[PDB]
From a paper:
In one asymmetric unit of the complex crystal, one thCENP-H/K heterodimer interacts with one ctCENP-INT homodimer. The homodimer of ctCENP-INT might be a crystal packing artifact, since the complex shows a 1:1:1 stoichiometry in solution. In the structure of thCENP-KCT, three helixes KH1, KH2 and KH3 wrap around the HH1 helix of thCENP-HCT. On the other side of the complex, helixes α5 and α7 of ctCENP-INT contact with HH2 helix of thCENP-HCT.
At the inner layer, a number of centromere proteins form a network termed CCAN (the constitutive centromere-associated network) that binds to the centromere throughout the cell cycle. [name] integrates into the [name]/K complex by binding to the C-terminus of [name], leading to formation of the ternary complex in which [name] is sandwiched between [name] and [name]. Our sequence comparisons and mutational analyses showed that this architecture of the [name]–H/I/K complex is conserved in human.
Residue numbers in the entry:
A (entry chain B), D (entry chain A): 8 to 197, 206 to 229
B (entry chain D): 184 to 227
C (entry chain C): 161 to 191, 258 to 328
């Protein structure tokens, strides 16, 4: 039932809203409802990420609705993760900063479901160089705090984060990340990030429990 | 004796750091091209 | 030793970067393309060659740059290079290679 | 503080119980309480798996109590999985079948936490060859149901499952595994596996929720 809905959203995604022979809001709500009930397979996730990440004619409300109901069934692939990472920052190919904050929030909430959590370590510099962008900084810091390992705490990133902390007048999300840095190198001069939506976490857990059934 | 090893190994660290930030800074979709993706991704 | 693999990886990567600069970046810098690619690669080569030449002396790693060089602007906006605070005609790389436990 | 508890339990596990100078059970109860509260990191899991699978002088009640409290924090490594796999079946060094049944129950309950779930596919024969052992058959069937892929459904395995199903009379755990074999192939003669302990599952989930915080 779900791949038929994505096939429709994909087609409507290709043509402007007023040229659509049907309003899409009814079909976006069917997809939203199916995702809330069943989750999104690995393959459906990948198609949804393309729809959320490439420039198309979908409206912001519909994209945010999809993002907020993107509960994975089973795992989360590198293909999906990297697409959201490549969406981040400024550029004519990239989505709005508001959706970017939602994608970053999402990655924190599904971090435990990545097939290859190390892939975020391989793009650590892409995430880190974006800390200047205030509109996504809180979500960036939380994700970076989960991704940071000792190999990433390099002197130039220590200095960059200290300068950014001083120039913003002390962002508490920046000092939370610096705390993680200090755990690897206590030599450094001195919010413990909580889950951003407990009810979403609880709903994901319910969906995920079906993986034990057979 | 071994200062040569990490000198070559560091020389890769500088190229990978600069190559990744250059491709990610260009604005190009580096995710959906294998060549560009290898340029950006650090090693596991 | 494992040393020429860190040399094989770096010669391979250096060719991939030069391909990217020629095929994609030089065109973007125009908005001729060939001229932009040659000067961005010269500048990155000069930048990297020096960073190591200092080793410890962080102060010596600045290259002289033409007044309005778009290459430097792009490298500074991409966070791969930094101007000198006192004057913006010299320019250093960010020192990705330096590591505390290297 | 969990390292020191395991150290002491390892030491006492090599001493026959009548020759000990102090009971080990109060320390096992401290271990069990710590596991319930914080779970077991990957490195602690390996040490506990060694305690549970190598022949020692710990009593069956103490081994079961640790198994029932073996909540992983984060992931389950291949080496941990393979320690348990290598303990299954009959052999001078292997644990009791009753403990083996709890090991297989555990693998089912932590299946979603394996770093590399494919590891169980590489030892498929080991699992499938144990099906005639009634004392672990219900737990084997559930794990087999989760792990079997098309490559594993060879003609000789289909026949052995039908031979075993005939020889036991009705066995709904075999019927359930044959149902799984019948998605991959259409052609042969025609109990959904629920999670064995929802309370354990719920408690594991709450411990796992800490991975989203930094």
């Amino acid at each position: 039932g779900l791949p038929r809905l994505i096939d429709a959203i994909e087609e409507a995604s290709k043509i402007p809203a007023k040229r659509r022979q049907t309003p899409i809001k009814p079909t976006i709500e069917k997809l939203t409802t199916h995702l809330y009930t069943h989750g999104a397979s690995p393959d459906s996730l990948l198609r949804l990420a393309d729809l959320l990440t490439l420039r198309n004619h979908l409206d912001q409300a519909s994209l945010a609705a999809i993002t907020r109901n993107l509960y994975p069934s089973s795992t989360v692939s590198d293909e999906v993760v990297l697409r959201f990472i490549g969406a981040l920052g400024h550029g004519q190919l990239k989505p709005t900063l508001a959706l970017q904050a939602l994608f970053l929030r999402w990655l924190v909430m599904v971090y435990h479901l990545l097939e290859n959590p190390g892939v975020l370590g391989q793009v650590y510099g892409v995430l880190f160089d974006l800390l200047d962008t205030a509109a996504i900084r809180p979500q960036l810091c939380h994700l970076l705090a989960l991704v940071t390992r000792r190999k990433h705490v390099r002197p130039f990133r220590i200095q960059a984060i200290l300068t950014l902390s001083r120039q913003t007048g002390g962002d508490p999300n920046l000092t939370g990340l610096l705390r993680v840095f200090k755990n690897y190198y206590p030599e450094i001069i001195v919010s413990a990030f909580k889950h951003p939506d407990p009810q979403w976490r609880q709903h994901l857990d319910e969906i995920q429990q079906r993986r034990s059934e057979a | 004796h071994e200062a040569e090893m990490k000198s070559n190994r560091r020389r890769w660290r500088i190229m990978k750091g600069a190559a990744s930030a250059i491709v990610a800074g260009s604005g190009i979709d580096w995710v959906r091209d294998e060549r560009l993706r290898d340029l950006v991704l650090d090693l596991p | 030793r494992q040393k020429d693999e860190w040399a094989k990886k770096t010669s391979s990567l250096m060719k991939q970067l030069d391909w990217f600069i020629g095929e994609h970046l030089g065109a973007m810098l125009a908005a001729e393309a060939l001229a932009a690619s040659a000067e961005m690669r010269d500048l990155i080569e000069q930048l990297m060659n020096k960073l190591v030449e200092a080793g410890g002396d962080n102060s010596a790693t600045y290259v002289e740059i033409p007044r309005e060089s778009a290459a430097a602007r792009f490298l500074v906006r991409s966070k791969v290079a930094m101007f000198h605070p006192n004057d913006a005609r010299r320019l250093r790389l960010v020192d990705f290679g330096r590591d505390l436990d290297d």
